Amino acid sequence: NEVAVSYSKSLKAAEMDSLQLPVDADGYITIFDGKTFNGWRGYGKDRVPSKWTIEDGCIKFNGSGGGEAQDGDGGDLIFAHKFKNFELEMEWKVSKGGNSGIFYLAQEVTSKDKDGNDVLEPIYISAPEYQVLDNDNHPDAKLGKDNNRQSASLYDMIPAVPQNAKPFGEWNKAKIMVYKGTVVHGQNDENVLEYHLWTKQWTDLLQASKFSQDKWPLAFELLNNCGGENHEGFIGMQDNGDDVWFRNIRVKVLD
Amino acid sequence: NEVAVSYSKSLKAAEMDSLQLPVDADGYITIFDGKTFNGWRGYGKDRVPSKWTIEDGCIKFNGSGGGEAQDGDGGDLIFAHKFKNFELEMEWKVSKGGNSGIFYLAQEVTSKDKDGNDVLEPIYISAPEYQVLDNDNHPDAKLGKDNNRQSASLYDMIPAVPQNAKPFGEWNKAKIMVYKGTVVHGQNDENVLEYHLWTKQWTDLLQASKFSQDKWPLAFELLNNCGGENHEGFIGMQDNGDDVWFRNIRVKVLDA
Ligand SMILES: OC[C@H]1O[C@H](O)[C@H](O)[C@@H](O)[C@@H]1O
Ligand SMILES: O=C1C(O)=CO[C@H](CO)[C@H]1O
Ligand SMILES: O=C1C(O)=CO[C@H](CO)[C@H]1O
Ligand SMILES: [Ca+2]
Ligand SMILES: [Ca+2]
């Protein structure tokens, strides 16, 4: 009925605590219980930012409209257990003109500034992103190439095809599967793209993107070796300043 | 057919008057009617400087050639309605060797001198600038870093790529989109750069620029929190002493 799932409590800490979480007959672990943030914390934080709330059985981000600013008590949210080979399913709903995302294989990364201080780097420069977007009203829908910034795309790299998103304010289903380097995104019960990590094709995707070695050398370095040395990392969701809702979040460990 | 657009009349005043302006089927409001300066005024002023005129359906700046001096009855021009999330489209045409600019998210800013008098501060220490330039003949085109002072650049910060300007005296199309901190510049129907306000990437871009916290503390403070507390401000155009023409000026409000 239940499986022990380890989790970390703060930046780059070991997963030295465990949660007893439900697991169904097909292996899917329910990692959001609809009532608490147990095992969840802000990216780089030891607490859940207060702009993330629980309402009607959902994780809700309460956005103020500043895009990547992450102002107020905000920041991206992670379920603090590193996964390697897994299949994530969840429902998501985005507000009109809204933008969020589902990250996977994320690392908590810091750099050093010129004086030796730590600088926490964005989750999205280590973590591939399954885009979450109002495809009809958010201007990013029209940016990038071939609609590779629309919902369920691998952000700025591979478009969702078919682009079968339901309209804003409606519930969509996401699937993200990572299995021995093979990645599939699903949207509303259809596979909408597939790729292979750590290949020549993967490098080419990066080199064509905002994360290219020439445009963002640190991002290229992290994403080109996605998941770090052990090829694992966190699932999470994006504070891009807009109201968004997530529910029925479940993960099956595949090996 | 038309929408009410509020505008302010003098320095830092509330927008307590409104104009009925045409809106098209896609939501773009025509803010320059080809005939009057309704809703427009000099930055810091309650009037249009007389070096700004209307000529053949265009807003024209009549330059005397003094560069940054703003001599005579000049000074930058603003459309006095603060926009937050918006997409601006206009056409611009620059005289040979000319320099101007399209400002956005501008604030009217004053500081105090040592005796407590007001000093009107330049529009560009609060307002990002879409550079307007004759890239073939203005020496600014060779200055800065990686052509980040050529037309449609975020002046002294992000170069326009591709640099697809038309030659001097030809019409160019400008786009400036600000949507929840995402900013895009367009030139001649291509997107030529993208950046994100209020991020550490934005801070880093300022700290490498002429508006760095070391070189210009007030500019840094204003630009680092671009648009002030409500993240909004004026669209406007630059008196850099050179003849320039603007036309077909339309803004679409992108959010509620
Ligand atoms: O602490 C503030 C947060 O929690 C409150 O309950 C509000 O529902 C939410 O809008 C806000 O982001
Ligand atoms: O949606 C996005 C966008 O609009 C801004 O950049 C973010 C990270 O690449 C992405 O999540
Ligand atoms: O074009 C410009 C230049 O030549 C001088 O500085 C101005 C303000 O930054 C800019 O608009
Ligand atoms: Ca996103
Ligand atoms: Ca200029």
Nearest-Cα distance to chain B for A65, in Å, is 6
Question: Which among A48, A55, A56, A62 is the best mutation to test ligand 1's pocket, defined by most ligand atoms within 8 Å of the CB?
Answer: A62
Instruction: For residue B182, give the nearest of B170, B169, B196 by alpha carbon.
Output: B196
For residue B139 the two structure tokens come to 């020496």
Token readout for A219 is 């991002």
As given in the structure block, the two tokens for residue B30 are 């025509």
| Cβ distance of A68 and B181 shorter than 8 Å | yes
State the alpha helices, DSSP H only, in A171-211: 200-207
SS3 B223: helix
> Of A34, A6, A30, A31, which is closest to residue A18 (Cα–Cα)?
A6
CB-based contact B89:B175 (threshold 8 Å): yes
Is the dihedral angle over the CA atoms B127, B13, B80, B132 positive or is it negative? negative
Q: What's the token pair of residue B137?
A: 């003949």
Measured in Å, residue A235 CA sits from the centre of ligand 1 at 23
How far apart CA A40 and CA A37 sit, in angstroms, is 5
The DSSP letter of residue A85 is S
A51: tokens are 């702009």
**Percentage helix, strand, coil for chain A under 3-state DSSP, each rounded to 5:** 10, 40, 50
The DSSP symbol for B229 reads: G
Give, in degrees to the nearest 5, the angle at Cα A227 between A223 and A230: 140
Cβ atoms of A67 and A240 within 8 Å: the answer is yes
* Angle, CA of B202, B207 and B209, to the nearest 5°: 95
Omega before A162 within 30 of 0, i.e. cis: yes
Residue B40 CA to residue B21 CA, distance in Å, equals: 13
Q: Among A180, A92, A167, which Cα is nearest to A130's?
A: A92
Q: What are phi and psi of B202, to 5 degrees?
A: -65, -50
Radius of gyration of chain A (CA): 17
The DSSP element (H or E) to which A224 belongs, if any, is: helix A217-224
Q: Kindly report the nearest CA distance between residue A128 and chain B, in angstroms.
A: 19
Which among A163, A160, A154 has a CA at the least distance from the CA of A210?
Answer: A154
Question: Dihedral, CA atoms, B235, B241, B242, B248, nearest 10 degrees?
Answer: 20
Is A72 within 8 Å of chain B by CB? no
∠ CA(A140), CA(A142), CA(A146), 5° rounding?
115
Listed in sequence order, the residues at least 6 apart from A2 whose beta carbon sits closer than 8 Å to its beta carbon are: A20, A21, A22, A23
CB-closest option in A69, A97, A138 to B199: A69
Q: Any idea which residue has 């600019």 for tokens? A: B101
Distance, in Å, from the CA atom of A240 to the CA atom of A74, rounded to the nearest integer, reads 9
Longest C-alpha distance within chain A, in Å? 53
Residue A24 buriedness (CB in 10 A; 0-12 / 13-18 / 19+)? exposed
Distance CA A181, CA A177 (A): 10
A91, A247 contact by CB (below 8 A): yes
Strands A118-120 and A110-112: antiparallel
Long-range contact set of residues B124-127: C-beta below 8 Å, sequence gap at least 24: B124/B155, B124/B238, B125/B211, B125/B216, B125/B218, B125/B219, B125/B222, B125/B223, B126/B219, B126/B222, B126/B223, B126/B226, B126/B228, B126/B233, B127/B103, B127/B233, B127/B234, B127/B236
How many CB contacts within 8 angstroms connect chain A with chain B? Answer: 46
3-state secondary structure of A172: strand
Q: Is residue A31 a contact partner of residue A251, using CB atoms and an 8 Å limit?
A: yes
Going by C-alpha positions, the residue among A173, A139, A146 that lies closest to residue A161 is: A146
CB-based contact B180 A241, cutoff 8 Å: yes
Closest CA to A130 of A69, A87, A96: A87
Q: How many CB atoms lie within 10 A of CB A160?
A: 25
CA distance A86 to B87: 42
- Beta-ladder partners of B132: B100
A66: nearest CB among B180, B184, B191: B180
- Which residues, 6 or more positions from B256, have their beta carbon under 8 angstroms from its beta carbon? none
Task: Please give the distance of CA A254 from its chain centroid, rounded to a whole number.
Answer: 18
Dist. CA A9–CA A216, nearest whole Å? 29
Sign of CA dihedral A83, A86, A91, A97: positive
Distance CA B136, CA B139 (A): 8
Sign of CA dihedral B94, B99, B102, B107: negative
Which mutation among B240, B242, B244 tests ligand 3's pocket best, with the greatest number of atoms within 8 A of CB?
B240
3-state secondary structure of B173: strand
Q: Closest ligand 1 atom to the C-alpha of A62?
A: 12
Distance of CA B185 to the CA centre of its chain: 12
Experimental approach = X-ray
* Tokens describing residue B100: 């101007």
The rounded radius of gyration (Å) of the Cα atoms in chain B is 17
CA A62 to chain centre: 17
Choose among B137, B139, B166, B170: nearest CA to B152.
B166
The CA-atom distances, in angstroms, between B200 and each of A136, B114, B206 are 29, 33, 10
Identify any residues that bridge with B240 across adjacent strands, giving them in sequence order. Answer: none
| C-beta of residue B22 within 8 angstroms of C-beta of residue B42 | no
Ion ligand 5: residues, CB within 5 A, are B 99, 101
Entry resolution in angstroms?
Answer: 1.9
The whole-angstrom separation of Cα B97 and Cα B112 is 36
**Is the four-CA dihedral A49, A53, A57, A58 of positive or negative sign?**
negative
**Residue located via tokens 């478009």:** A159
Report the CATH architecture of A2-253. Answer: Sandwich (2.60)
**Would you say the CB of residue B121 lies under 6 angstroms from ligand 3?**
no
Tokens of A213: 């070695």
| Side chain identity at residue A130, one-letter code | Y
Count CB neighbours of B54 within 10 A: 16
Q: Which ligand is nearest to the CA of A63?
A: 1
Tokens (6 digits) for A193: 């793209």
E runs forming strands in A62-213: 77-83, 86-94, 99-106, 110-112, 118-120, 129-133, 172-179, 182-187, 190-196
H helices within chain B, ranges in order?
A: 200-207, 217-224
Domain boundaries, chain A: 2-253
Per DSSP, the residues of B149-160 read TSTTSBTTTB--
Residue type for position B79? F
